[PDB]
Amino acid sequence: SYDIQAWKKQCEELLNLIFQCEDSEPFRQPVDLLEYPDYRDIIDTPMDFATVRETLEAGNYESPMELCKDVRLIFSNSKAYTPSKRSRIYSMSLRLSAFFEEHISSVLSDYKSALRFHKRN
């Protein structure tokens, strides 16, 4: 239970689950500026689940906290871009965020516990 490296496969499996959710489809790829011409006026740092998966598989996350910051940026971008808090795509983002936070909590707890055990003495 003190495996320092276990978070990585746990996050690969959670991303697989997110890619099976219909609620993820708007968040799997970048925004087309012909469809949303003002998107980059509002959003300084775009983020999507394909970018998160590629960053993970490249070995360019050091911890699950860093992955969690990028996933949370997908959801804050949707809340900043939405013209209404009842919109279809924003409503999908809130359900997907609740599912992600329910599943990532044990991944973060186990990782932090494992590093504390590594430094115990």
User: Is 17 within 8 Å of 103 (Cβ atoms)?
Assistant: yes
Our CB check for ligand ZJR shows the closer of 10 and 78 to be 78
Q: Of 65, 82, 103, 110, which one interacts with ligand ZJR (CB under 6 A)?
A: 82
| Count of chain residues binding ligand ZJR (CB under 6 A) | 13
**DSSP state, residue 45:** S
Amino acid identity at 83: P
**Residues 17 to 46: which contact ligand ZJR by CB under 6 A?**
25-26, 28-29, 31, 35-36
Distance of CA 60 to CAs 15, 16, 37, 52, Å?
16, 18, 31, 10
Which residue of 40, 54, 87, 115 would you call a contact of ligand ZJR, by CB under 6 A? 87
Distance CA 69, CA 100 (A): 12
Number of H helices, E strands in the chain: 5, 0
Q: How far is the CB of 11 from ligand ZJR (least distance, A)?
A: 21
Closer by beta carbon to ligand ZJR, 87 or else 113: 87
| Pick 81 or 100: Cβ nearer ligand ZJR | 81
